[PDB]
Write a protein that binds this ligand. Sequence first.
Ligand SMILES: Nc1ncnc2c1ncn2[C@@H]1O[C@H](COP(=O)(O)OP(=O)(O)OP(=O)(O)O)[C@@H](O)[C@H]1O
Ligand SMILES: Nc1ncnc2c1ncn2[C@@H]1O[C@H](COP(=O)(O)OP(=O)(O)O)[C@@H](O)[C@H]1O
Ligand SMILES: [Mg+2]
Lengths: 56, 460, 115, 458, 86
Amino acid sequence: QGVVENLASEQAARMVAMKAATDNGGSLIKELQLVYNKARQASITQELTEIVSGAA
Amino acid sequence: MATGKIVQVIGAVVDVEFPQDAVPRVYDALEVQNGNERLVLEVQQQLGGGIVRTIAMGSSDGLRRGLDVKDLEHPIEVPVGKATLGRIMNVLGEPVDMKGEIGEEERWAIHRAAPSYEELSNSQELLETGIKVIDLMAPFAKGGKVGLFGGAGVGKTVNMMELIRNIAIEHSGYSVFAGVGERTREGNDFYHEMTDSNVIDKVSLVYGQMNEPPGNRLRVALTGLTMAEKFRDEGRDVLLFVDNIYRYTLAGTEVSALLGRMPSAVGYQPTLAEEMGVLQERITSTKTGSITSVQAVYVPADDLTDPSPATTFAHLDATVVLSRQIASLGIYPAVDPLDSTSRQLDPLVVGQEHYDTARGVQSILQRYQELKDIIAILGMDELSEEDKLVVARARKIQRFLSQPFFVAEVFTGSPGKYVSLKDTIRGFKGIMEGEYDHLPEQAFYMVGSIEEAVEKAKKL
Amino acid sequence: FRDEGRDVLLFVDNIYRYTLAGTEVSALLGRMPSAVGYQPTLAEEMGVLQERITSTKTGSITSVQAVYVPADDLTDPSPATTFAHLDATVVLSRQIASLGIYPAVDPLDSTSRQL
Amino acid sequence: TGKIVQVIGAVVDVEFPQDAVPRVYDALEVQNGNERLVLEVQQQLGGGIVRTIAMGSSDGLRRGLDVKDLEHPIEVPVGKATLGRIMNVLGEPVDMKGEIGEEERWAIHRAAPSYEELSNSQELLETGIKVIDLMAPFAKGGKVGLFGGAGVGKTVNMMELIRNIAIEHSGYSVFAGVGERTREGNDFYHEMTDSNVIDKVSLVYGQMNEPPGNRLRVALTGLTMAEKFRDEGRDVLLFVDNIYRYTLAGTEVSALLGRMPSAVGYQPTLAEEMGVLQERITSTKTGSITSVQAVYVPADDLTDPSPATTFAHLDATVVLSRQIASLGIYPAVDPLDSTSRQLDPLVVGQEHYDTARGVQSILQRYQELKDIIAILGMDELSEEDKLVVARARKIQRFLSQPFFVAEVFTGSPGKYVSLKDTIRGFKGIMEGEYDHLPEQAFYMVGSIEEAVEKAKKL
Amino acid sequence: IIYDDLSKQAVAYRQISLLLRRPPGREAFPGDVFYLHSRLLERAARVNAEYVEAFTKGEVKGKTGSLTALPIIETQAGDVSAFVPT
Ligand SMILES: Nc1ncnc2c1ncn2[C@@H]1O[C@H](COP(=O)(O)OP(=O)(O)OP(=O)(O)O)[C@@H](O)[C@H]1O
Ligand SMILES: Nc1ncnc2c1ncn2[C@@H]1O[C@H](COP(=O)(O)OP(=O)(O)O)[C@@H](O)[C@H]1O
Ligand SMILES: [Mg+2]
């Protein structure tokens, strides 16, 4: 009986742990995307500055 | 008599030499005969030596150096007023439909100054659209800007037609539609869908089709805006639809690049915020009438930090979000109640009853989403009586957000309904506070007012 | 050798520095710069070289070419333009080599139109 | 004898007769209404045209004003008479006291000391702050640089260094206010005068409201004074309020001088402008200059060319970070980037080196565990990785310290920690002998004693 | 030969170029910055004994000479993608 209850407790604990992990993964996506978009905008600005300041 | 001569032709950019005492002013309009067609040039810069640099409102092919340029002493002028309702025009106010010459009581210049401070309305009225989701969750200020954040395929155009219809019938307003950067195919069948729904007599159409040069597309927005200004000066409240504001931003970028000005930010023009402000500050409520605007917004790279969204969001008052998921439920219109918002939702401008009702339905729907995740992972057995009450009232609320349009009768067959704000407030008040718990959720779906919900239930 | 009617092998030890010498030259020729600092004529110059390297009804040239991809990017204009011209493509990857496996060929990006 | 012929922003062009054209860096002079304006020559153009930077307001200049050619550089008061007083970029007194009774004046443009004249020293100069001394020891006669973004504490840290260093230093000192807030300087001056230490400090101010020429040449002036006190054979303390502004002033002027932009819009001569100033603030066989330089980094970007080229010119570099300040931990030094040329087993001893490397190893391992902690949380760590995390968190907290100049913010009393105490504390924490206290016990405590005492107070 | 911070050479050639108003390139470096380091590093060679005999006019026979180079480059936070490092 103790073994079976500990198995059910394992399943419930893994359930709550995976819930927390999924939420933390989404919350990390939302930060990596800000880093990515800022790098995108900066790269466009710098390349176009080199091109326009390159002519003449 | 023509007095200028073309000096250069480089793409859409054309340079013209006038006599030193007569140099045309900025945004003046000029005409040349390009073969056996007239071509309109818009002045952009007054260079030294009496030479003005212009942009061709049409194909610049076939222009020779040394043609004769005729100086119209005014900007591009377009016809205005009631005679333009139901017609289709290009940038220049010329009819592109085949119904022939326009009445032309008056012709007005597209480049106009903005309303000044002492002319602005000393009040902050609301516009009653008659659509339950919008008037409840994202109310429009009269003279405000509204942003439509949805892709095609979810009902953008039927929503637009419903607003046109309701503002024409239930008020005494007209509408102007400006198709900036629109595929020709769409223009054709938007025209068909309005003519086969009897709303065409109450809207004016100006189309900038994508095959047109960048100068055409940019000034198409201003043409629609000046027609709306004429309807405002007549004392009406007017709706102006912009088919994509992002296309206006990009047309400005392209023109600025062609003229050779130094780029800014993420490669946009240096004048980005000024050009947006020039467009958006004319759309306001005055002491005679008002122009309200509903503007479709595209966000580049899904990035809300990009300068075009960042500049546009400075001007929007309300924000309507359309959802593929909500549409899949059979719920129409497919507005998302949790992501759509309006900065008119405060007790100080909208009142405490409306504020607390909107906040209440938002809370119920959010809690319902969390409970629906719990149901997905663990079934309904986990819910307490309070949770089941919340879920039931949330389902009744969600059903009650649907509405039959006078434009949608073709599909549903049900007569269209215009729902007054008081009725919407009362309906969600009642459903939230446990009244009408005794009648089923399908009595609320696609019915109309809450009285109509209970009368649907009695034999459902 | 081809026009004499023979079948020959042409080994070119790196095509990238043809384009790169073109870039150094282009800057001082007064050509207006292009994307990623490359010359405007990059694709034209590459095409004028690669089209001569073919097998005709009179004879055959068989060609093996190494191409430097800067920073393993594989995405900047010089590697991008050169992909179009080739029949067989073998893309060596730093990652496989770093793990110590030779040859470093990536089977998920390498292929031949003879397969 | 000369006429103004173009006026572009802060840059002024002047025409002179072909036989009378000024040398580079000569000082010119103009009447601007009722004001006197000084112009410094930057370039000689063709045909007697000469291009200059206005050392003052450019507003109100017409074309055609007569310019007078003073046939010498900008020269400033120098020596024992400049002590306890506040001065302009042009060497003018800006306090309301009278004339500076200087016996000598030096030109601000000078050649750097020879390689044959240089000197080296291993003498550790203890600074009270615990983190700086353990991680990045600074020796007398060397250069120290405080790197940080906007509002991360690089001014306040320098005020603590001023307090602690002045305990064991007897000689004169020079302070150069370059392109910073006027209020910081005013507050500093009144703190100095109310504690009667002003009699030993000489101050030059070029703060951020002044036009570009003033902010550009104010730094050179301060070096001129520090070099006088060095060349008298003394030892001198030179504090520079913000060296970043000096490069930025050159950026502001550069495009108007007709020069193509480089890298991220900077002047093409950036490295030489920084080097030509940095190489003369140095020690010699006759005397030594000890210097602390605040280094602002734009947009928190430590890879930007100006901070990047500043790194190479310093002996001890302390790198502050916003992420640590946001956690409450002050002084917000990053131990995994702060470094010193003096952290050697021979210089500081094997204990001083082994403790620092243990601290770095533990912290570096803390960083690599953060991604798995972020995704999965701490319970999936190994049973000794948990111990590493606990000790790393304790170490992070014990690096924090109350400052005597932060009582105006924290309200807590300040603390001074000597070397024979902080390395003992960190060695004990690393060896786990103090592992039983809770994390909060180490926050803002001076020594290990105060941590265990604070743990008794929970 | 230990060249130290060959990057701090590239900055110098850039300064000369931009002051001489030549057309700028990527990261504003001159186009011919590859040629600078390329014709410096290719001097590091091992030369056969016949070259040594031809150069020394027969004074040294049968010995090869050598020059070994150890250039040093600084990376901005390790990005190999930069122009001079690549
Ligand atoms: N030891 C400390 N304890 C608490 N707060 C501190 C400490 N050191 C600095 N600060 C905080 O930093 C603020 C600004 O300090 P400081 O002027 O040194 O920063 P900075 O990075 O040099 O800024 P700036 O470049 O704007 O002058 C202080 O007002 C205080 O809030
Ligand atoms: N109120 C509505 N009633 C019935 N169907 C609708 C309604 N709104 C949208 N739809 C359905 O959505 C689909 C696309 O509608 P459409 O008006 O073409 O969208 P959009 O204007 O976004 O292109 C059609 O199948 C249409 O029937
Ligand atoms: Mg400060």
